[PDB]
Design a protein around this ligand. Sequence first.
Ligand SMILES: [Zn+2]
Ligand SMILES: [Zn+2]
Ligand SMILES: [Zn+2]
Ligand SMILES: [Zn+2]
Ligand SMILES: [Zn+2]
Ligand SMILES: [Zn+2]
Ligand SMILES: [Zn+2]
Ligand SMILES: [Zn+2]
Ligand SMILES: [Zn+2]
Ligand SMILES: [Zn+2]
Ligand SMILES: [Zn+2]
Ligand SMILES: [Zn+2]
Ligand SMILES: [Zn+2]
Ligand SMILES: [Zn+2]
Ligand SMILES: [Zn+2]
Lengths: 114, 114, 114
Amino acid sequence: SHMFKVEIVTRPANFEKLKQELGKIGVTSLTFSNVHGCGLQKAHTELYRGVKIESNVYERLKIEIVVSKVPVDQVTETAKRVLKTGSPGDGKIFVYEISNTINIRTGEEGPEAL
Amino acid sequence: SHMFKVEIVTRPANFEKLKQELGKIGVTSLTFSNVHGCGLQKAHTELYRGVKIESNVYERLKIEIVVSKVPVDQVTETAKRVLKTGSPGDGKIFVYEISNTINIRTGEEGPEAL
Amino acid sequence: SHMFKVEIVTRPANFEKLKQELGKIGVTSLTFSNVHGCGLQKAHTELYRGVKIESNVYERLKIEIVVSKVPVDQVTETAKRVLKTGSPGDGKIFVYEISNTINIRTGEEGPEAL
Ligand SMILES: [Zn+2]
Ligand SMILES: [Zn+2]
Ligand SMILES: [Zn+2]
Ligand SMILES: [Zn+2]
Ligand SMILES: [Zn+2]
Ligand SMILES: [Zn+2]
Ligand SMILES: [Zn+2]
Ligand SMILES: [Zn+2]
Ligand SMILES: [Zn+2]
Ligand SMILES: [Zn+2]
Ligand SMILES: [Zn+2]
Ligand SMILES: [Zn+2]
Ligand SMILES: [Zn+2]
Ligand SMILES: [Zn+2]
Ligand SMILES: [Zn+2]
C-alpha cells in the first residue's frame, strides 16, 4: 500500500536496456530529463590554512519512476545491474516516500492511480 | 503546520487556466519545467517465452507547488478539474511531505517561509 | 543515519561561491538545472466580485544536494549566507527525508553510498 518514487541520476548511456528491463518487471511509465552533475573536491592552497575547491560539471540523466505494486527493491536492483560499469560516473539512486498519487484522467488515488 | 510539495506531471496545454485557479485559492508561486514521459508496454515476441518492451516518448510539463496554509487537497482537486480532458495523457499528481522550508531573503523557517 | 535531500531554488547568480562554501563543509557532489519560477498575485477586476490573477515568469536555478554525514543544518545555513542579497528573488530551500540511497558503481546502500 506504500508508494515510492525512485530517482536514478546517472550517465546518459544505456537508457534503452533500462527501459527493457524496467518494462519487464512491471513499470509502465517513467519521466526523465537532462541535468548537470558537479563534483567537488578539497584542494590545497599554497598556505597551510587554505582550502580551495575544485569542481567539474558533467552530464546527467535524471529518471523518475513511481511504484506501488511493483516493488521498489526490484526496481533498484534492476537499475544497478543494467547501469553498472564500474567506471566512475555510474550515478546514484534515491528512494522517497510518496504521501499520495492522483491519476488526473480517471480521478483515482493511491496505488490504483498508477 | 505540515508542509507539502505538490508535483503535477502533465500535458503542456492548459497552463494558463491553472495559474488562474491556483492563484485564486491562495498559491503565490510555483516552479515548472519541460521533461519527457515514457510509456512502457509488454509486447509479444515470436517465441512463447519472449517479452519485448515497446515505448513512446512524449512531452511533459512538470509543475511544483509547495503549500502549508493552503490545503493540499484544495490544490490537488483544482488541478484535477482544470487539467482533466478524459483523453489519455492527462498526467498525474504526486504529494510529498517536506521536512522544512527556508526563505533565503528573510531567513524564516516553516510555513512562514512560504 | 538519516539521509536528506536539500533542494535550493534560486537566482542564477552566485553559483561559484556556493560550490566553494558547500565544498568546504564536506559536500562532494550535487546536481543542478534551470527551471522557471512563476509568481502569482490576486488582482482586482472591475466588478466587486472579481478576482483576476497576474503572473510573471522568471529564471531559476534548481540545486540538489543529498547529505547524511554532512549535517543538513550546516548545508542550509551556508546556503542562506551565500545566496542572501535581501532583494526579492533570493529563492527558497526545501528539505526532504530520503528512504534510501544506492551507489550504482559500488553497490552500497545508506549513508555509505554517498
Ligand atoms: Zn525529483
Ligand atoms: Zn552543459
Ligand atoms: Zn593532505
Ligand atoms: Zn594545505
Ligand atoms: Zn587539478
Ligand atoms: Zn521534484
Ligand atoms: Zn524531446
Ligand atoms: Zn496475451
Ligand atoms: Zn508471447
Ligand atoms: Zn506497435
Ligand atoms: Zn527534486
Ligand atoms: Zn524561459
Ligand atoms: Zn483590496
Ligand atoms: Zn475587487
Ligand atoms: Zn500590473
